[PDB]
Paper text:
IDE can effectively degrade insulin, amylin, and glucagon, pancreatic hormones that control blood glucose levels, as well as amyloid β (Aβ), a peptide implicated in Alzheimer’s disease. IDE has at least two major conformational states in its catalytic cycle; open-state IDE captures substrates and releases products while closed-state IDE performs catalysis. Within the IDE dimer, each IDE subunit consists of ~55 kDa N- and C-terminal domains, IDE-N and IDE-C.
We again applied IDE dimer-focused classification with signal subtraction of the IDE-FabH11-E dimer to refine each conformation separately, which improved the resolution significantly. The three apo-IDE structures derive from combinations of the IDE partial open (pO) and open (O) states. Furthermore, two subunits within O/O or pO/pO states have noticeable differences in the distance and buried surface between IDE-N and IDE-C and the dihedral angle. The IDE pO and O states differs from the pC and C states by 5 Å to 24 Å increases in the distance between D1 and D4 and 7° to 17° increases in the dihedral angle, respectively. Open-state IDE has an opening just wide enough to capture its substrates, for example, insulin, TGF-α, and MIP-1α/β, allowing the IDE catalytic chamber to attract these substrates with high dipole moment via charge complementarity. Our cryoEM structures reveal that only open-state IDE can capture its prototypical substrate, insulin, and release cleaved products.
Residue numbers in the entry:
A (entry chain A): 46 to 963, 981 to 1011
B (entry chain B): 46 to 56, 58 to 962, 989 to 1011
Write the structure that this text describes.
């Protein structure tokens, strides 16, 4: 079905990726990306057949069939052969399914696109449906639904899908488990594979495909490659499944629900089923609704709710739904009188809607949002060849080929009829209510069948209703003022004579530390700024940590109302506690960095506290404390492990207990004492100059000395923290019982040595070589569990090797198969040939060496090095040049007498996490019981620290 | 002369019963029988002084009682008695006073009969031939020659000389070259005629008082020496006494200006007062001695120090002859004390008028009464020589029942006597004597005997009557009392918890309580030690400075209440720790709950005065930038004690941080420390466990009562670890003293943690190189004066140190130290067994020693609990393991860590230079790349 139509695609003029689109005669919208300078090539394929397009008897059939579409072709009927060719050239495919789409994507290392795409086209010929792939992938779909059993967003999602008309096919079930895929069909005698081959042959080939290929050859050669390669798919003309009305057909409207979640949260949910406006992408009323409802400005709804102290944060807007209709949500946090006086809350909502009904739509908001998305859209930097192409392929169904990039990202017109129409749609006649609170025990009878949430109707009497329609007035509510953080600084600064490729210490004092680099590649009017404020007092005591976090918490609570316009304009910020101190990250444009930073430094320099707002902050973070008995036991193990593997660390119980006495005057005395004496370390990166960096930095520290009288710190009070020495042959462990999860976790730690030139490439290469066979034999082959991880841990200037594994097992039994895996690796090293080794270190070499593709990434990497005080910005040459100079026997020496169980250099410690109720292993040394972790750490050495490069 | 008077003798801790009796020749005999004395003794007092001297020859009686030593008729040889003293440990001495001549000696063990028969034939036959005369006159010339620089006899002779020169109080007491053989022979007077006249008619007559500290029995030496001493013959020698004070309105209301030889500055105030020797019932002048030298609430010296003029004072009842007595007040002088003398005397008269206003007091009387009753009850011991001669000194004046309650007990209250001496404490009665170096060109009147010069300079009348006229009540007020329970001081019997080492009777996350009852000493004593652990003590220079100054002014605060309790016999000490605060309570079992409750209530609710803060601030600031001025070995010790701990705030940043200490910032600092804290506690001595728990409960209840103290977390009862050296490195750098030209240096060796092997490895090698260091380094090489070696117990880690200040190149000095260490290596390896064994026995007795008081074992046990070791049986184990060693054993200790080729060498030095390996640029960056030692497991 060879067909082709393409030309210039509007491409946000910073990019060099040459574009074309085409559509074959079998309903295959192919997008052509030609960037002959790309490192990673990739391709992706979306089919507009979703899980609302499932057969009505078996749900997630297309889901499991595209799982099965992976394995087994007619040209290569081998099971993993596609994935095996992605292991030959480092590719990592995945695919996904939505209510309207089923989307596929893969990658390839550089140029091997003929190979992988040849393995990719012939999926349509012969799926196999053998014992292993079918009967094991259905187990993975069961685990897939099972990990989403307790995931509350999908829970409340499916309950939204389910509490409408159960007759309407919008209310179908999106993803089924093994009970629905091969337990109900065969007990009903339904052949699963007949359905499978039916769907696969008669439904895939028809239409609705979307394709994108990131190739680096040209447009035309890859065009007559693929259009030649793709003619086997033939147009069967399956029609597009659309729904012309929502299921919420007057049985479930103007109704309340009180739902019991899995996590202890409190949220309010109001929903409006609304028709589609995808046809109006040139005017886009949905960005106007989300921009105007979720605005945080003067006279806004959220400003009033902060003023009444009911909502911490919120999100609302138009949510996608079926093809014909969509949804409109408002999601807010709840306090005390958020729990008791919900009626008045909805009255306040009606008041804000009354303000929207008073002044109606606005044009200056249109023009302003148009300019913001216009300029911000045309300054895309670059993109990842994976994920971006899957996104564009995801939206390639809805747009002609020149509108696939400027989808709503250019707005010509203004359609107040639409905004007034959906304003007419947003009425008390059109309301679904869902209350989320854990506290509704003994109160909620109607239980969810699949996931298990519990709820009730509590029909609203007519008095409240009649008062809701007639009493809609305006009080404080005002339209949101025009933005002022709109940028004009779009001038690329020419590079100076100072042409360093890395940030130099351009300012050295006893007060500060200043690192700076101007960009050379991305050529954007943007900058990234990171700042840490050292302090001794940040982690001295649980009380100090509590007052630091609650202080900075209400600080961020304070600065929200000013920051909202800048953050909506593309000027991000961050406030963060460390054990060291406050952490300030600033990311945005080149225009208004002094302005924003100045008001931030001035605000947190002299700062004031509200009473009942802080009472809410106290209560809320107090609820956030005791929620740390409910996490995944691998997270519990990683928390405790890096708890133990530092110098000082406060436990969450003792941090939880210290808030019993924290009053506002104790804090208000504490604050300037905390702020009294501190240091500042700074990285500045982006399209600014050295002199302006000097200016900004001097400005900040001057502002600080003006407000809070910061004096520099002596070099005998800038300390770091060490990591615990192990007794050089010990294998130590302890256990913790989780209460929520019926699963055991484990993490085992191996101290090699500091980051020296030998140890870096030893531990990285050995990590790589223990990475893929662990996945190949422990999660895949031995079928231990789903949470299986192996690899490095370099922290506190100390390298390490780790295994992060969560299953439902006895932990010494788990240890036994860990050691069996260690013996398995032990023999699997010694039997490896030279060529596998050479491909493996070539893989390591190209995996490690790469420049990033975003300025935010590499700045965060450099900052993460600077907070570790290493500064070796030329790890690349040193490490890569060292890596060629390794042998097999080096690793043998690295494994046997240092890492193995028969080793005089065992720096070995395991962590057991016990569940809520609880092929050869040798005779390991005896463990230790650990009662007091402190009395364990009592007599134990501590490491040196690292010489900075 | 067998006369006899005896009965039951009242004496209560001591049980050795003694008894007094009078002989018919006028000898007061006291029997002392102590069969537990090593050296026995005896003493005789003669009530013949230098007031019986002839007016023509001065100091005759001192030379005559000297002449009785040499020459008997049994043994007229020159050193023969002296040979009986050198063979039998004897050492006699005797003196002459205004009214007494007293004899006292010792003897080796039991040599009674020998010394007795010699002591009879001293008084039966003295010979006085020629050689005794002509040789004893040189000893008397030395008796005069020793008083050139002897200030006691100089100032006292100046007291003898500034009165009536006709009165026999103006005679001399010793006799010099001039009066003994320059003054008689030109007058032709025979000295020996008067010597035999004086000896016969005045020495031999009466008024002897013998006392003999013996170990033999109570009756055998008694009926030996009763018959044996009849050689004394009654002649009724008159008592040379004065019926009036010798300073009689010639020199009254007069000043003196004295120029000394030593640079001292003093002010002397004198009141002559009539005899109250009969008045031992109330003893008002000594009661005034209680009221003058009191330094307490509302005292005189409180304002005088508060005006900053007078350093110290002393006052009280000074004896004279029998007839008269004196009352003196003698103070120290500052520079500006010279300028405000009139105001000083003005405040003195203000205090006199305050005592005249409120009159006598009874509480003071009962208080002194009870305090001397307890101090009489709990007397320690006695000197084997001198005690006898002293109580024989008061045996002349008191009946046989009053010889023990000598001044330690008072019968009656006499306010009329106090008003009498208040009539004596008037501006009409004052005698003034100023001692100052600055009186140059000022002192005309020359002393008669010595030849120094002084001057009267009477005060003109504007100031005299202003002393009279201004007699007002001001500031000065009465003291306070702590006489809670003077009846119960009972010993507490040891119960079923018979442990020789302290048991932990209470441990929480809030406190830690260790307990031991006495077994050895069984005294009315108790010792209490308290550590108050808190995180906030060493957070920065600022909180550490504010904690230091906090407890500093707390010590300044407590004092004002504390002095009246200190008068009751309960001492204390506050000094903080680097961890937290440390509290000491030492004393009786009597009233420390009542005390300690008020101590906690005060240090919990604490205030600051502003100028008090300023003075302590400036003063410690001065003490800080003063520390740049001391000896460079102290610089090396303290800066190495910085370089080898976990965290350390230096004195430079401690010095700078005092700019920021304001009173409200401290006022915020106070409850923050006090909000949450930990207590470490030892209660040790003859005390109980259950009441210790009740007291501890009172403590924590008071802590919750004031600041709502809740415990500290159990991962923050931490210690500080010590830095691990890089296993072979010997690195060095230098420091600079600023003031002194001397160089400092310190040499360091890390062996190990305190294990049982390492304690004795360390002690044994340290002392085995200690005595040859005496043999070759200070004596032979003459390196310096600050030369020290020995252990280094720090953060539970042993170490070896060498403390040397000299003026040397430091590497040169290191070179000869290491040459001494190589010398010690061969000097061990050539050692025989005998040196080795004598040395390990030396070390054995060096380490092994029984305690001597509750405070000693308390200091040891608590001194180990503060190191968290708790190894309470190091005594047997450690020392028994030291005996199981050879010399090559400590060589094996000296090879792997201590030798020059050592593979575990942990050696690091500190040079402190005058003002005129690897380097260490930054001590933080030094400690950046080096490992750390672990901590010690508490037993």
């Amino acid at each position: 079905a060879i067909k082709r139509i393409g030309n210039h695609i509007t491409k946000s003029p910073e990019d060099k990726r040459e574009y074309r689109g085409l559509e074959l005669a079998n309903g295959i919208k192919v997008l052509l990306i030609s960037d002959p300078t790309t490192d990673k090539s990739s391709a992706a394929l979306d089919v507009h057949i979703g899980s609302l397009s499932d057969p009505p008897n078996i749900a997630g059939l297309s889901h499991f069939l595209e799982h099965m579409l992976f394995l087994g072709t007619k040209k290569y009927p081998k099971e993993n052969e596609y994935s095996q060719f992605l292991s030959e050239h480092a590719g990592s495919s995945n695919a996904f399914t939505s209510g309207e789409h089923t989307n596929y994507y893969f990658d390839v290392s550089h140029e091997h696109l003929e190979g992988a795409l040849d393995r990719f086209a012939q999926f349509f010929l012969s799926p196999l449906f053998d014992e292993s792939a079918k009967d094991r992938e259905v187990n993975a779909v069961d685990s897939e639904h099972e990990k989403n059993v307790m995931n509350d967003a999908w829970r409340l999602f499916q309950l939204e899908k389910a509490t409408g008309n159960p007759k309407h096919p919008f209310s179908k079930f999106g993803t089924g488990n093994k009970y629905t895929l091969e337990t109900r069909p065969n007990q009903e005698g339904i052949d699963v594979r007949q359905e499978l081959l039916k769907f696969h042959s008669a439904y895939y080939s028809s239409n609705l495909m979307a394709v994108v290929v990131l190739g680096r050859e040209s447009l035309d050669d890859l065009t007559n490659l693929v259009v030649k390669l793709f003619s086997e798919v033939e147009n069967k003309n399956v029609p597009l499944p659309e729904f012309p009305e929502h299921p919420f057909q007057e049985e479930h409207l103007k109704q309340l629900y009180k739902i019991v979640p899995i996590k202890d949260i409190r949220n309010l949910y109001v929903t409006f089923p609304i028709p589609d406006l995808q046809k109006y992408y040139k005017s886009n009323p949905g960005h106007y609704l989300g921009h105007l409802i979720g605005h945080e400005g003067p006279g806004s709804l959220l400003s009033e709710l902060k003023s009444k102290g009911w909502v911490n944060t919120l999100v609302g807007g138009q949510k996608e739904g079926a093809r014909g209709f969509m949804f409109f949500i408002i999601n807010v946090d709840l306090t005390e009188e958020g729990l008791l006086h919900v009626e008045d809350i909805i009255l306040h909502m009606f008041q804000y809607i009354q303000k929207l009904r008073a002044e109606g739509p606005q044009e200056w908001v249109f023009q302003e949002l148009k300019d913001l998305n216009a300029v911000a859209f045309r300054f895309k930097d670059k993109e990842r060849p994976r994920g971006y192409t899957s996104k564009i392929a995801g939206i390639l169904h809805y747009y002609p080929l020149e509108e696939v990039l400027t989808a709503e990202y250019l707005l010509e017109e203004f359609r107040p009829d639409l905004i007034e129409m959906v304003l007419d749609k947003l009425r008390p006649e059109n309301v679904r209510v869902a209350i989320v609170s854990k506290s509704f025990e003994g109160k909620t009878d109607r239980t969810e069948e699949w996931y298990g949430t519990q709820y009730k109707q509590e029909a609203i009497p007519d008095e409240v209703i009649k008062k809701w329609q007639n009493a809609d007035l305006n009080g404080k509510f005002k339209l949101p003022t025009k933005n002022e953080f709109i940028p004009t600084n779009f001038e690329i600064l020419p590079l100076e004579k100072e042409a360093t490729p890395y940030p130099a210490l351009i300012k050295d004092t006893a007060m500060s530390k200043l690192w700076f680099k101007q960009d050379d590649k991305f050529f954007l009017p943007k900058a990234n700024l990171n700042f840490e404020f050292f302090s001794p007092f940040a982690y001295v005591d649980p009380l100090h940590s509590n007052m630091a976090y609650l202080y900075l918490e209400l600080l961020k609570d304070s600065l929200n109302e000013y920051a909202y316009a800048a953050e909506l304009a593309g000027l991000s910020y961050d406030l963060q506690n460390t054990i060291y101190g406050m952490y300030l990250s600033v990311k945005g444009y080149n225009d208004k960095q002094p302005i924003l930073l100045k008001k931030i430094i001035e605000k947190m320099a002299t700062f004031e506290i509200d009473e009942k707002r802080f009472e809410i902050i106290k209560e809320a973070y107090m609820r956030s404390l005791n929620n740390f008995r409910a996490e995944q036991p691998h997270q519990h193990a990683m928390y405790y492990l890096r708890l133990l593997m530092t110098e000082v660390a406060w436990t969450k119980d003792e941090l939880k207990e210290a808030l019993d006495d924290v009053t506002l005057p104790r804090l208000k005395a504490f604050i300037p004492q905390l702020l009294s004496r501190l240091h500042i370390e700074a990285l500045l990166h982006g399209n600014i100059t050295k002199q302006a960096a000097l200016g900004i930095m001097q400005m900040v520290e001057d502002t600080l000395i003006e407000h809070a009288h910061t004096k520099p710190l002596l070099p005998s009070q800038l300390v770091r923290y060490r990591e615990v020495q192990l007794p050089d042959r010990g294998w130590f462990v302890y256990q913790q019982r989780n209460e929520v999860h019926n699963n055991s976790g484990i993490e085992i730690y191996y101290q090699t040595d500091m980051q020296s030139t030998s140890e870096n490439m030893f531990l990285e290469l050995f990590a790589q070589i223990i990475s893929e066979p662990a996945f190949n034999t422990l999660r895949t082959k031995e079928q231990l569990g789903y949470i299986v991880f192996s690899g490095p841990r370099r922290a506190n200037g100390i390298q390490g090797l780790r295994f992060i594994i969560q299953s439902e097992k006895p932990p010494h039994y788990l240890e036994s198969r860990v050691e069996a895996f260690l013996i398995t690796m032990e023999k699997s090293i010694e039997d490896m040939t030279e060529e596998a080794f050479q491909k493996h270190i070539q893989a390591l070499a190209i995996r490690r060496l790469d420049k990033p593709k975003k300025l935010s990434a590499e700045s965060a990497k450099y900052w993460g090095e600077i907070i570790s005080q290493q500064y070796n910005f030329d790890r690349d040459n040193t490490e890569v040049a060292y890596l060629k100079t390794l042998t097999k026997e080096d690793i043998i020496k690295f494994y046997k007498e240092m890492l193995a169980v028969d080793a005089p250099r065992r720096h070995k410690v395991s962590v057991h996490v016990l569940a809520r109720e609880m092929s050869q292993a040798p005779a390991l040394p005896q463990p230790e019981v650990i009662q007091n972790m402190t009395e364990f750490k009592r007599g134990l050495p501590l490491f040196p620290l690292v010489k900075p490069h």
